């Protein structure tokens, strides 16, 4: 968690140097942190982060699958 947050902070900090590259780096780091929150059983934060990613990057399939997996874990199979 500490390292993922530092990576997000660093990508944000040095985004002006290259916004395009650092945006993609932050997208992957953000997905990692959401997966971690899932690991730490913070499924609300993980779900919010997955939805935040999907809102801006609707082509990130893994976020859809993680939301579905969390829903399945909840027991909501539909």
């Amino acid at each position: 968690k500490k390292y993922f947050l530092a990576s997000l902070d660093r990508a944000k900090a040095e985004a002006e140097h290259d916004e395009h590259y650092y945006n993609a780096i932050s997208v992957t780091t953000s997905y990692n942190l959401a997966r971690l929150y899932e690991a730490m059983c913070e499924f609300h934060e993980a779900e919010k982060l997955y939805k935040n990613i999907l809102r801006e990057h609707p082509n990130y399939v893994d976020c859809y699958l993680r939301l579905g997996a969390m829903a399945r874990d909840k027991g909501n199979f539909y």
């Binding site: 395009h20 993609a24 997208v27 992957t28 990057h57 609707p58 082509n59 990130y60």
Partner: peptide
């Protein structure tokens, strides 16, 4: 989905280096 087709390149860029 109109906005989706414009983001295909960006998502491909993201995934290319993961």
């Amino acid at each position: 989905r109109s906005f989706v087709d414009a983001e295909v390149d960006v998502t491909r860029d993201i995934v290319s280096r993961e």
